[PDB]
Amino acid sequence: DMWDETELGLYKVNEYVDARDTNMGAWFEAQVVRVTRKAPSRDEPCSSTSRPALEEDVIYHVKYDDYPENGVVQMNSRDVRARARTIIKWQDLEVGQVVMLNYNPDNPKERGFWYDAEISRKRETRTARELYANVVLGDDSLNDCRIIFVDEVFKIERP
């Protein structure tokens, strides 16, 4: 069974977060409506020395702000974070940074959705500001993609 959890979560009921969609991998604003953990065993404490309960243990149940029709969806803790808020300007970007940026996999020249990405190239020539990144970081990432929206790269918020 699922038990409601009030301590381990980094995000509380009613708080807004960014949540990573389970189908497309992009980040969308959402409201936390419930935080749960798996039920402890009958003869085990909620937290033990062998297995200290951890924030990564919780499941967040969220409702997307712009997709209410999707209903309440369950999120792994790695798929919820504080809303993005700070751009990393062009001059501060570098290879190896992991950022949230805007990319359209189907039409890469055009505006898309917001994905985690690892910068793979960063160079300014007389002709262009070249930014490439491995986009949709995780399984089946899109490697070494040319990024259009080089002035709209966000820092990822971390606890």
Residue numbers in the entry: 127 to 285
How is this structure described in the published paper?
Recruitment of the DNA methyltransferase DNMT1, which installs CpG methyl groups on the nascent (non-methylated) strand in DNA replication, is regulated by ubiquitin-like with plant and homeodomain and really interesting new gene finger domains 1 (UHRF1). UHRF1 acts as a macromolecular hub through five known functional domains. UHRF1 is overexpressed in cancers, where it inhibits the expression of many tumor suppressor genes, including BRCA1, P16 and P2120–25. We focused on identifying binders to the UHRF1 tandem Tudor domain (TTD).
